[PDB]
Amino acid sequence: SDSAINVMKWKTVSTIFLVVVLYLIIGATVFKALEQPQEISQRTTIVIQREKFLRAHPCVSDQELDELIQQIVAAINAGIIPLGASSNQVSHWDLGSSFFFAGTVITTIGFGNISPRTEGGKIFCIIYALLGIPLFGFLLAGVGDQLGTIFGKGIAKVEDTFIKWNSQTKIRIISTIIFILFGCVLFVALPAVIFKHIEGWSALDAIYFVVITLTTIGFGDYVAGGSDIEYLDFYKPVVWFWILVGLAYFAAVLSMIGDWLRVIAKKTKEAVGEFRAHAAE
Ligand X SMILES: CS(=O)(=O)Nc1ccc(C(=O)NCc2ccc(Cl)cc2Cl)cc1
Ligand Y SMILES: CCCCCCCCCCCCCCCC
Contact between 25 and ligand D10 by CB under 6 A: the answer reads: no
61 versus 161: smaller Cβ distance to a copy of itself: 61
- Is the dihedral angle over the CA atoms 75, 79, 85, 88 positive or is it negative? negative
Give the C-alpha separation, 226 to 79, whole Å. 11
Q: Provide the minimum distance between the beta carbon of 7 and ligand Y in the complex, in angstroms, as a whole number.
A: 32
Q: Which does 213 bind (CB under 5 to 8 A by kind): K ion, ligand Y, a copy of itself, none?
A: none
Residue 105: is it exposed, middle or buried by C-beta count within 10 angstroms (0-12/13-18/19+)? Answer: buried
Q: Within positions 177 to 236, which residues make up the interface with ligand D10, using CB under 6 A?
A: 204, 207
74 versus 135: smaller Cβ distance to ligand Y: 135
The CA-based angle 103-87-69, given to 5 degrees, is: 80
Q: Tell whether residue 120 is among the known ligand binding residues.
A: no
Question: What single-letter DSSP state applies at residue 112?
Answer: -
Q: Provide the minimum distance between the beta carbon of 113 and ligand D10 in the complex, in angstroms, as a whole number.
A: 24
Q: Within positions 109 to 138, which residues make up the interface with ligand X, using CB under 6 A?
A: 109, 113-114
Give the C-alpha separation, 263 to 281, whole Å. 28
Q: Provide the minimum distance between the beta carbon of 223 and ligand X in the complex, in angstroms, as a whole number.
A: 5
Residue 226: is it exposed, middle or buried by C-beta count within 10 angstroms (0-12/13-18/19+)? Answer: middle
Phi, psi of 96, rounded to the nearest 5 degrees? -90, -40
Q: Which does 110 bind (CB under 5 to 8 A by kind): ligand X, ligand CCCCCCCC, K ion, none?
A: K ion
Q: Within positions 163 to 222, which residues make up the interface with ligand Y, using CB under 6 A?
A: 204, 207
| Residues that bind ligand X in the complex, under the rule CB under 6 A | 92, 96-97, 100, 103-104, 107, 109, 113-114, 223-226, 236, 239-240, 243
